[PDB]
A paper describes a structure:
Azoreductases are a related but previously thought to be distinct group of NAD(P)H dependent flavoenzymes that have been identified in a number of species from bacteria, to mammals. In order to help understand the mechanism of quinone reduction by azoreductases the structures of [name] bound to two quinone substrates (UQ1 and AQN) have been solved via X-ray crystallography. We have shown the azoreductase family are very active NAD(P)H quinone oxidoreductases with broad specificity profiles and as a result they may play an important role in detoxifying the quinones secreted by many of the host organisms of [name]. [name] has a preference for benzoquinones e.g. Bzq.
The structure of [name] bound to AQN was solved at a resolution of 1.8 Å with final Rfree and Rwork values of 18.5% and 16.2% respectively, while UQ1 was solved at 2.0 Å with final Rfree and Rwork values of 23.6% and 18.5% respectively. In the structure of [name] binding to AQN, AQN makes hydrophobic contacts with Phe60, Phe100, Phe120, Tyr131 and Phe173. Neither quinone oxygen is in a position to form a hydrogen bond with Asn99 upon reduction as has been previously observed most probably due to the bulky nature of AQN. The binding orientations of UQ1 and AQN differ significantly, with UQ1 binding parallel to the ring system of FMN while AQN binds at almost a 90° angle to FMN. These differing binding orientations correspond to those observed when methyl red binds to either the wild type enzyme in the case of AQN and the Y131F mutant in the case of UQ1. In the case of AQN one would expect the δ+ carbon, which accepts the hydride, to be the carbon attached to the negatively charged sulphate.
Numbering used by the authors:
A (entry chain A): 2 to 126, 129 to 190, 193 to 212
B (entry chain B): 2 to 123, 130 to 186, 196 to 210
The structure:
Amino acid sequence: SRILAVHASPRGERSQSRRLAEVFLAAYREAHPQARVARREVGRVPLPAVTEAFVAAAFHPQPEQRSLAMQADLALSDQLVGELFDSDLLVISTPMYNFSVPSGLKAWIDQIVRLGVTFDFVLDNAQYRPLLRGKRALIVTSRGGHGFGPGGENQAMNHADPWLRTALGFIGIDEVTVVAAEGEESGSFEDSCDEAEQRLLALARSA
Amino acid sequence: SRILAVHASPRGERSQSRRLAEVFLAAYREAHPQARVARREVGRVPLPAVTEAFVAAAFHPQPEQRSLAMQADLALSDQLVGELFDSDLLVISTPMYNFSVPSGLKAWIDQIVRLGVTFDFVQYRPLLRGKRALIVTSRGGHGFGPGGENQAMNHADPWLRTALGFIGIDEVTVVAAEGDSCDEAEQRLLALAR
Ligand SMILES: Cc1cc2nc3c(=O)[nH]c(=O)nc-3n(C[C@H](O)[C@H](O)[C@H](O)COP(=O)(O)O)c2cc1C
Ligand SMILES: Cc1cc2nc3c(=O)[nH]c(=O)nc-3n(C[C@H](O)[C@H](O)[C@H](O)COP(=O)(O)O)c2cc1C
Ligand SMILES: O=C1c2ccccc2C(=O)c2cc(S(=O)(=O)O)ccc21
């Protein structure tokens, strides 16, 4: 089995989303000594935004005719997509930043949603089709505040993990589990972290 | 009379969101000859993401004691916030990219939501007053607007409303072109500009 872990917090040792995700990965490895884990850093590394050159290349009507310069514009995207194609399970760790995700993780999504590679379309009278099959995802997220989850007072303000679900679903990753810790700013954060940890150990050991 | 225009499409001449917003701006200037427009590019220029250094500086409990290095970490943020302070009307142009906004615009928001500057806590409260915003957005698909089949999937302009509302900008208008709609948007913008 093959895991791709995408870490989105810019924090290091102090990132709770990174820490929780790494609890999961360690527990998974304990149960699956032969599994391979690849990490793609998008929080502590600036992941480039989509440019006009990326757009021209990624939507070129005859992709085989792309110049070597166009291929250079897509080289990073190709690498990021390949990582996902090589994986069975995608783990994304992310803070909530201003009701969404850190910009680096948005840039990652923007590199991996690719016409003819992770989705396609046909024209009837465009009808989109996902191209990733057989994958699952786990989103591990930390939030300073409270009530962003289902039934929460602030649920409507959450454009972080629900948005990720939609973006991933578009390319075919429909089986998505979310594990959230809340209260990081106040610090019953211990309880929320403890609950997230236990949930992640159960998930790792059953996978 | 003072406008801050934040353009988020990485495309230049070819950008429809940029073009529609510039139609608005030109019409607004004609109607208000004294207006000033500041342009802050976040689509064609790589605006840095929040770093752990940013977080340490921005959430410093005693900001008057920030070192010169920490102030450097916030210098771009201060400039971006300052542009917003100086404006009466914020115009944001943006495509929808993968059900949200291009990453540069997320980066811009992450720089301008600032503890003790654009919001505070006691409960979080907004600190900007007297501003309004116009979001001009373009989408390749359809049904992402109010009452649309895909409304629940729109994490672009509804998310911008939430973030902008948190810092105190709650008079927000959205003009969207989807898929004709552009011509409808263009006519809506000319009317708004007058
Ligand atoms: C730039 C920034 C924006 C944030 N925005 C939110 C937010 O919108 N809602 C929230 O509950 N917490 C917010 N927080 C608090 C973080 O979500 C929380 O500290 C989280 O645990 C950080 O993830 P990490 O520990 O993996 O770095 C924000 C923190 C920062 C630094
Ligand atoms: C990377 C990328 C992602 C896109 N994602 C979406 C999307 O999620 N939904 C949609 O309706 N259109 C999507 N589109 C189509 C654009 O929103 C549309 O072409 C838009 O008008 C571009 O704005 P612009 O002309 O100002 O650059 C996407 C286009 C690109 C290049
Ligand atoms: O609806 C679209 C969409 C939906 C969900 C994810 C991505 C896209 C997209 O890239 C797109 C592009 C274009 S294009 O004009 O750039 O080809 C049109 C529509 C869409």
